[PDB]
Amino acid sequence: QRNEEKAQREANKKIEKQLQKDKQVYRATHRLLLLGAGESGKSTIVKQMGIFETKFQVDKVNFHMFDVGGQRDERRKWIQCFNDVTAIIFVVASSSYNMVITNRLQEALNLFKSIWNNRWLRTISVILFLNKQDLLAEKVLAGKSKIEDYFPEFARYTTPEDATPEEDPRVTRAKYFIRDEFLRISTASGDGRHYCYPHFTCAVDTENIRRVFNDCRDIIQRMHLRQYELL
Amino acid sequence: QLRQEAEQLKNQIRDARKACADATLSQITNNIDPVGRIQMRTRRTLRGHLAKIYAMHWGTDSRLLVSASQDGKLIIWDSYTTNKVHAIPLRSSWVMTCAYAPSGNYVACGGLDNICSIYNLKTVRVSRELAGHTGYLSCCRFLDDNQIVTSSGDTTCALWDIETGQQTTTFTGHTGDVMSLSLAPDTRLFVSGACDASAKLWDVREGMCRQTFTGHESDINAICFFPNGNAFATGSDDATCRLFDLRADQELMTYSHDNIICGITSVSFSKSGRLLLAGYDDFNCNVWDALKADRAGVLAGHDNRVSCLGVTDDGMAVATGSWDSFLKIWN
Amino acid sequence: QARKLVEQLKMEANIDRIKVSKAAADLMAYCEAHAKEDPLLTPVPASENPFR
Amino acid sequence: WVVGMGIVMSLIVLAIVFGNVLVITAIAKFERLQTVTNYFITSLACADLVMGLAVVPFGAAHILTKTWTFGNFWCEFWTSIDVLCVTASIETLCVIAVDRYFAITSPFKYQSLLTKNKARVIILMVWIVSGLTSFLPIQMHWYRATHQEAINCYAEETCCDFFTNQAYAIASSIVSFYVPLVIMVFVYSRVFQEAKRQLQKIDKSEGRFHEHKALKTLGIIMGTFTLCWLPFFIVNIVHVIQDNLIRKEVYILLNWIGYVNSGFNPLIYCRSPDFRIAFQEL
Ligand SMILES: Nc1nc2c(ncn2[C@@H]2O[C@H](COP(=O)(O)OP(=O)(O)OP(=O)(O)O)[C@@H](O)[C@H]2O)c(=O)[nH]1
Numbered sequence: 099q100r101n102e103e104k105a106q107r108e109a110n111k112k113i114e115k116q117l118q119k120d121k122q123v124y125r126a127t128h129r130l131l132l133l134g135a136g137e138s139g140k141s142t143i144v145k146q147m148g149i150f151e152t153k154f155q156v157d158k159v160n161f162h163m164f165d166v167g168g169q170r171d172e173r174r175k176w177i178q179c180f181n182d183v184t185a186i187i188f189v190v191a192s193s194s195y196n197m198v199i200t201n202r203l204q205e206a207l208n209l210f211k212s213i214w215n216n217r218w219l220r221t222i223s224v225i226l227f228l229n230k231q232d233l234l235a236e237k238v239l240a241g242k243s244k245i246e247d248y249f250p251e252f253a254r255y256t257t258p259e260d261a262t263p264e265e266d267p268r269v270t271r272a273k274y275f276i277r278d279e280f281l282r283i284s285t286a287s288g289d290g291r292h293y294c295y296p297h298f299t300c301a302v303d304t305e306n307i308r309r310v311f312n313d314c315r316d317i318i319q320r321m322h323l324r325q326y327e328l329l
Numbered sequence: 330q331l332r333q334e335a336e337q338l339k340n341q342i343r344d345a346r347k348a349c350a351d352a353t354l355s356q357i358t359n360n361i362d363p364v365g366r367i368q369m370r371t372r373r374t375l376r377g378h379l380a381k382i383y384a385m386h387w388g389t390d391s392r393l394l395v396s397a398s399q400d401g402k403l404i405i406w407d408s409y410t411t412n413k414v415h416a417i418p419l420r421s422s423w424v425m426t427c428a429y430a431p432s433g434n435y436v437a438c439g440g441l442d443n444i445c446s447i448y449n450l451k452t453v454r455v456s457r458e459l460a461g462h463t464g465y466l467s468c469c470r471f472l473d474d475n476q477i478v479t480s481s482g483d484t485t486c487a488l489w490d491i492e493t494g495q496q497t498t499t500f501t502g503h504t505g506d507v508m509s510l511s512l513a514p515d516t517r518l519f520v521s522g523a524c525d526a527s528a529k530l531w532d533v534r535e536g537m538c539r540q541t542f543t544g545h546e547s548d549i550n551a552i553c554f555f556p557n558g559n560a561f562a563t564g565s566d567d568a569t570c571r572l573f574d575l576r577a578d579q580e581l582m583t584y585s586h587d588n589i590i591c592g593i594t595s596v597s598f599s600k601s602g603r604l605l606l607a608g609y610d611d612f613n614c615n616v617w618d619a620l621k622a623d624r625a626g627v628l629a630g631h632d633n634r635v636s637c638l639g640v641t642d643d644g645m646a647v648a649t650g651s652w653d654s655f656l657k658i659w660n
Numbered sequence: 661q662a663r664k665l666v667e668q669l670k671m672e673a674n675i676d677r678i679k680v681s682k683a684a685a686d687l688m689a690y691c692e693a694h695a696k697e698d699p700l701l702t703p704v705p706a707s708e709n710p711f712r
Numbered sequence: 713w714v715v716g717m718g719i720v721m722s723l724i725v726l727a728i729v730f731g732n733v734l735v736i737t738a739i740a741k742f743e744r745l746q747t748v749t750n751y752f753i754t755s756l757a758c759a760d761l762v763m764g765l766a767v768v769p770f771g772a773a774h775i776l777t778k779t780w781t782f783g784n785f786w787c788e789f790w791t792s793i794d795v796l797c798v799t800a801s802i803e804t805l806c807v808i809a810v811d812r813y814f815a816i817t818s819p820f821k822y823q824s825l826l827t828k829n830k831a832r833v834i835i836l837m838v839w840i841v842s843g844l845t846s847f848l849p850i851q852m853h854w855y856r857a858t859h860q861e862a863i864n865c866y867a868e869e870t871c872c873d874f875f876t877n878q879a880y881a882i883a884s885s886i887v888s889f890y891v892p893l894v895i896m897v898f899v900y901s902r903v904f905q906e907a908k909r910q911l912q913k914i915d916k917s918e919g920r921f922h923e924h925k926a927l928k929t930l931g932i933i934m935g936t937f938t939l940c941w942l943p944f945f946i947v948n949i950v951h952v953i954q955d956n957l958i959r960k961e962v963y964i965l966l967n968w969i970g971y972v973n974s975g976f977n978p979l980i981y982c983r984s985p986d987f988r989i990a991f992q993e994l
């Protein structure tokens with residue numbers, strides 16, 4: 099009667115006190131989702147720097163990344179759970195324009211278009227890594243395979259004036275064509291609520307964590323600026 | 330050869346169903362009096378979840394319930410006095426379902442890790458882990474204290490043995506992800522709604538499919554038995570609900586409106602089976618009439634998408650959950 | 661695969677089907693018989709309502 | 713023209729007490745509008761409501777009837793409430809500006825920096841400092857002037873005017889206006905710099921396929937407050953540095969123009985889809 103009433107209210111206070119400490123950790127961490135095109139070398143990127151989860155901290159900021167490998171299908175019903183993440187990391191092998199596996203770049207572009215135009219992922223940015231740059235450079239300077247054979251739009255294309263090559267012009271032209279193939283889809287569908295951040299990545303790069311940190315900082319800053327009607 | 334025989338048999342099944350349709354359910358129930366207007370009000374509101382909620386299951390005593398959230402917690406409530414009883418942390422933060430044992434001794438859980446976990450309430454530590462599925466779990470229901478039925482995203486369902494952690498039997502035949510299931514009142518048959526817009530009726534003892542219903546047009550999200558046990562209802566993301574009869578092997582009635590275009594996330598029946606409660610993507614819930622197919626009430630007290638819905642065994646209260654991390658008790 | 665699918669359709673085709681006028685009548689009879697113990701249809705007094 | 717003047721002053725009272733009550737009820741009734749940022753808005757709305765309920769009507773009646781009938785004690789209490797309500801409203805805008813500055817400039821530590829307890833402590837501190845400036849010096853007759861006209865004014869019971877010395881005027885003007893002005897100017901300069909930097913960043917990446925909003929918003933926010941409150945706090949120093957330069961009618965006109973600002977805060981800080989939806993629901 100009266101004795102049991104106080105006992106229940108005593109255990110509620112202990113539980114409600116524990117939930118206050120857990121809320122501090124939850125709000126101070128950032129969640130990232132990692133995707134891939136199938137043979138993009140995304141495991142190498144993770145290792146160098148059901149479901150697989152990793153924890154890491156940079157500049158006293160906690161990040162926590164998710165990798166899905168237990169589910170493999172053309173239909174992604176579970177993609178609606180990741181509508182509260184900070185950003186999505188998309189890894190694509192840019193040196194596979196001649197691999198029929200119809201080629202792999204077309205499938206990667208279709209997957210990117212499907213992910214971008216989603217009912218639930220309408221406010222989430224994408225950090226895009228264009229992996230395997232050395233292989234693309236070698237296969238371009240080889241001269242045996244031409245991109246225009248598989249992508250006829252490459253016949254009439256010129257390197258943009260606002261470009262920053264490090265080299266031989268052919269690889270710069272190929273790289274900028276391939277990244278524009280993604281930037282076009284990114285800019286066409288969007289309405290300013292989310293952007294895309296393309297990066298060129300290799301097998302020896304050790305500055306990918308810095309890129310993720312800076313992109314997340316930009317994402318949050320742009321979010322706040324748009325919320326305050328300043329942008 | 331083989332393909333031609335299958336097509337020929339599909340025509341025979343369809344032809345037989347046409348001869349059994351003397352009339353429709355709507356024509357017979359024209360003289361019955363309308364239910365009228367139904368108004369419900371929120372009695373309790375439960376707070377404490379740090380993230381959006383996926384699952385909820387009432388207790389057999391009609392007083393305690395459990396809920397799951399994306400933050401990684403499994404909180405057991407007290408609906409009467411609004412007091413938290415337990416709070417079980419989870420190894421994996423991606424949970425999609427939960428269940429409460431008929432005897433109140435155990436609670437099950439599962440999600441994107443393709444594992445079902447059983448906890449011992451009256452001992453709270455992990456008691457058993459069941460593995461073998463190759464896809465995310467979608468639902469789980471307790472047959473008794475030592476058996477459980479699970480459905481996953483690998484287009485298969487299984488019956489487990491908690492004592493030894495082995496699959497007693499496996500059910501195959503679906504071509505898409507299985508999204509939900511529901512057990513018969515006597516616990517001898519169950520139905521499953523999958524992503525190929527088809528529902529099947531299984532046999533637990535034998536392990537074989539008996540009947541198949543293909544009336545919908547899109548992904549099936551929810552399923553529920555009629556209290557009698559001779560009928561069930563389904564809800565898909567084409568904003569339609571359908572009532573199927575087992576003894577007639579065909580659809581009886583459809584519940585749809587011209588002003589609804591969003592999907593349906595959950596369905597449930599009333600104690601007498603007269604009312605049908607369904608949750609929608611437009612942030613609110615609608616109440617239908619099972620025998621006449623007309624709206625009778627609206628529950629619009631939530632701010633985000635409604636994901637779960639349940640009715641007590643004694644039929645006194647209705648509990649709903651949504652993506653704004655709040656549960657509400659409607660009476 | 662093809663052989664198994666053929667057998668399944670044959671198994672499901674040979675069942676007894678009753679007419680809709682019986683199933684609808686049974687559903688209506690059950691609803692009418694059990695409408696008395698439905699607290700959601702007829703509201704209960706606040707004295708006997710644990711939530712109010 | 714007394715009938716016409718009363719009509720206008722009656723419209724000012726209704727506008728202040730209508731919008732501010734709407735903001736308070738909308739935040740309290742609903743649960744999606746209860747955030748850290750909205751506590752400062754609630755405090756500002758409460759201050760504006762107290763002003764519009766307990767300052768404008770009595771001052772309007774005093775102006776129209778040309779005589780104070782409520783005695784000396786209520787004159788002094790009205791003056792104290794006036795100063796307290798003016799002081800506590802300008803200092804909340806500075807808090808809002810600093811909140812936005814911390815939100816935009818340092819986005820990773822914003823969640824840890826601001827919490828409900830810290831917001832409550834800040835609001836209580838602001839109101840305490842506002843109360844110390846208004847009631848404490850006035851009710852203890854530390855603000856009184858020394859000339860013969862002031863002596864006659866305090867002696868007469870029907871007369872209720874404002875006379876003050878140099879030190880109190882300077883200190884109160886500084887505390888009420890001048891620190892928040894420079895703080896807000898610095899904050900919004902930094903915010904504008906960050907906004908234009910992000911705009912420049914966006915253009916470089918996506919220029920081929922594709923600062924009016926920020927300038928307009930900042931211009932509105934700064935200009936309304938400055939144009940409302942600057943001339944009064946200038947003539948506050950001017951009339952005490954030089955005795956014969958400023959009359960009394962200009963003083964009252966500028967003070968009332970400053971008073972009018974209380975009716976514009978809902979139109980500036982409550983323009984969002986959530987607030988508009990809440991207003992439509994009510
Ligand atoms: N030159 C070069 N080779 C790479 C790079 N990334 C992956 N590889 C090749 O990939 C081989 C190993 O395969 P993984 O990179 O692990 O491919 P994966 O992890 O299975 O990729 P996913 O299946 O999409 O997850 C290595 O031997 C490398 O030769 C790269 O960035 N540059």
Ligand SMILES: CN[C@@H]1CCc2c(ccc(O)c2O)[C@H]1O
Pocket residue numbers: 791794795798799874881884885888967
């Ligand atoms: C009578 N009106 C008063 C006069 C002086 C004064 C005001 C407001 C804030 C201050 O810090 C002041 O010193 C005005 O509201």
